[PDB]
Design a protein around this ligand. Structure first.
Ligand SMILES: *[C@@H]1O[C@H](CO)[C@@H](O)[C@H](O)[C@H]1NC(C)=O
Ligand SMILES: *[C@@H]1O[C@H](CO)[C@@H](O)[C@H](O)[C@H]1NC(C)=O
Ligand SMILES: *[C@@H]1O[C@H](CO)[C@@H](O)[C@H](O)[C@H]1NC(C)=O
Ligand SMILES: *[C@@H]1O[C@H](CO)[C@@H](O)[C@H](O)[C@H]1NC(C)=O
Ligand SMILES: [Ca+2]
Ligand SMILES: [Ca+2]
Ligand SMILES: [Ca+2]
Ligand SMILES: [Ca+2]
Ligand SMILES: [Ca+2]
Ligand SMILES: [Ca+2]
Ligand code: NA
Ligand code: NA
Lengths: 276, 276
């Protein structure tokens, strides 16, 4: 017999329970909960004892993995009997398999068990350091969601937290510009625009101070994050890595700057200055 | 503004949040979950400080009870500010009340909070020693249910555990009869029938030995549990209390016995004997 249901919980007995389970009986149960993990325990366990539970037995098994097997009598110690132990499936699926091989010598009362559903905690994260909340984790029953620190705006991915850097321009002859939340790690999934223009008769110079930190690779030139600068009709970039690019001078009075940062990385960002 | 919704959880901000909450603002929120208790915490708290939070404030209040009040700034210590503390409603209802009295001197950013639902555990029972599981408690998410020990049958009340004593008769001249699971407390909500008949020429005698324990009152004669015996056309009973009734003889060969036990009480029951 193959029986399948869900609810939030359930009750499962051996055939003929509380009385002795019939000979050569083979039964299976598929158990699923949508957002949760399956928890199961045994209120009563009495079965035929054998070597590695070959004859009579109960088997807790997931899709790709077998969780456990149980047989024998709960009264006898040093057994493989489940007793008061509680089996919990990693995934949202659990399958139970009861088998009576051929015949019982002495009649065994069988087993009585009860399952239920348990909320997966994504703040404890279960499986850890996978795709998960950037800043703030919030776990409700049957799922979770994320939020951001004051000043940070939640990105469309519902996971990472971005900021708005596009609202700034620099008028003065001299000054110093940084990355958002410098020296601290720059906000993920963000595009920053820094524009500097001057009245004619002024040539503009640029220098990189302090620490320079951007996620990079010995491979192709800055696939993840980068900085690129536009002066007149000519551009300079992309720039990344630990080593800061050498100081650069620009004839034109008009300069635009782009700093793009991806969804990943803890990289701390940069700082530079400008004078005419 | 009066806003009400449920889901499993939610997010609540002050008016105009993250920016300063407008002057003379008064808002209320009704929050309900069907089977659960309402849990609430604050991710951000910034409000106008005052005496006992008279001016600007947030108020967590149930139907018949006020849970807490909060005001001031989270940055300042020795405050009444909620901070990292978590408010939990005893019942399934929670109401939030935000008020800005008249006007802000300095603009306060307001507050950001998140609620959710939490399973009521009936095995820990919350409020304890109320109507609850006789033998075995099982708590799932959003409710519970009960079961019984091996040999006990669950009564229609879904709570108490009964037994079937009606399937026994006593043929022999001499013998001793007891209550179910004697000396241990008799099963609740049960009706037991013990029948004894003999061939003619025999008169039957009765005596009460050992302990005699039945739930009773100095008031009216055994409203809760009792024993009553039927011999011929005459009856004897009801009998209860600690003191056992005196030995009784019966002319007739036919005797029927009834022992009725209610939903309550731990009383241990009785034992007696019969000889002809
Ligand atoms: C029950 O689970 C088994 C495990 O492999 C699967 O083969 C079978 O199709 C499932 N049946 C139902 C009705 O889900
Ligand atoms: C993000 O959350 C919103 C909720 O408003 C939902 O509509 C959207 O489908 C979600 N997208 C992703 C990629 O999770
Ligand atoms: C909200 O709760 C208050 C508390 O007394 C009650 O008076 C009001 O009727 C409730 N409104 C709704 C829509 O539930
Ligand atoms: C007891 O549980 C059964 C479930 O089969 C339900 O139908 C019935 O209404 C319940 N009665 C009480 C008094 O709880
Ligand atoms: Ca067998
Ligand atoms: Ca969850
Ligand atoms: Ca990065
Ligand atoms: Ca005010
Ligand atoms: Ca519950
Ligand atoms: Ca009683
Ligand atoms: Na930075
Ligand atoms: Na008893």
């Amino acid at each position: 017999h193959t029986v399948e249901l869900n609810e939030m919980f359930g009750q499962i007995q051996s055939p003929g329970y509380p009385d002795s389970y019939p000979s050569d009986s083979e039964v299976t149960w598929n158990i699923t909960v949508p957002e949760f993990r399956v928890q199961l325990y045994f209120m009563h366990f009495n079965l035929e004892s054998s070597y590695l539970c070959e004859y009579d037995y109960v088997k807790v098994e997931t899709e790709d993995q077998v969780l456990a097997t149980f047989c024998g009598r709960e009264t006898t110690d040093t057994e493989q009997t489940p007793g008061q132990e509680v089996v919990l499936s990693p995934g949202s699926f659990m399958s139970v398999t009861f088998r009576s091989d051929f015949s019982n010598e002495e009649r065994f009362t069988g087993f009585d068990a009860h399952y239920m559903a348990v909320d997966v905690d994504e703040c404890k994260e279960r499986e850890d350091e996978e795709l998960s909340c950037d800043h703030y984790c919030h776990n409700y029953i049957g799922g979770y969601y994320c939020s951001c620190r004051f000043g940070y705006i939640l990105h469309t991915d519902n996971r990472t937290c971005r900021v708005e850097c596009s609202g700034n321009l620099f008028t003065q002859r001299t000054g110093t510009i940084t990355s958002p939340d410098y020296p601290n790690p720059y906000p993920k999934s963000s595009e920053c625009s820094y524009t500097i223009d001057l009245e004619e008769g002024f040539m503009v110079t640029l220098h990189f101070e302090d620490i320079f930190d951007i996620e990079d690779h010995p491979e192709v030139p800055c696939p993840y994050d980068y900085i690129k600068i536009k002066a007149g009709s000519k551009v300079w970039g992309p720039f990344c890595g630990e080593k800061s690019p050498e100081p650069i001078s620009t004839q034109s009075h008009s300069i635009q700057i782009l700093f793009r940062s991806d969804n990943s990385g803890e990289n701390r960002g940069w700082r530079l200055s400008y004078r005419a």
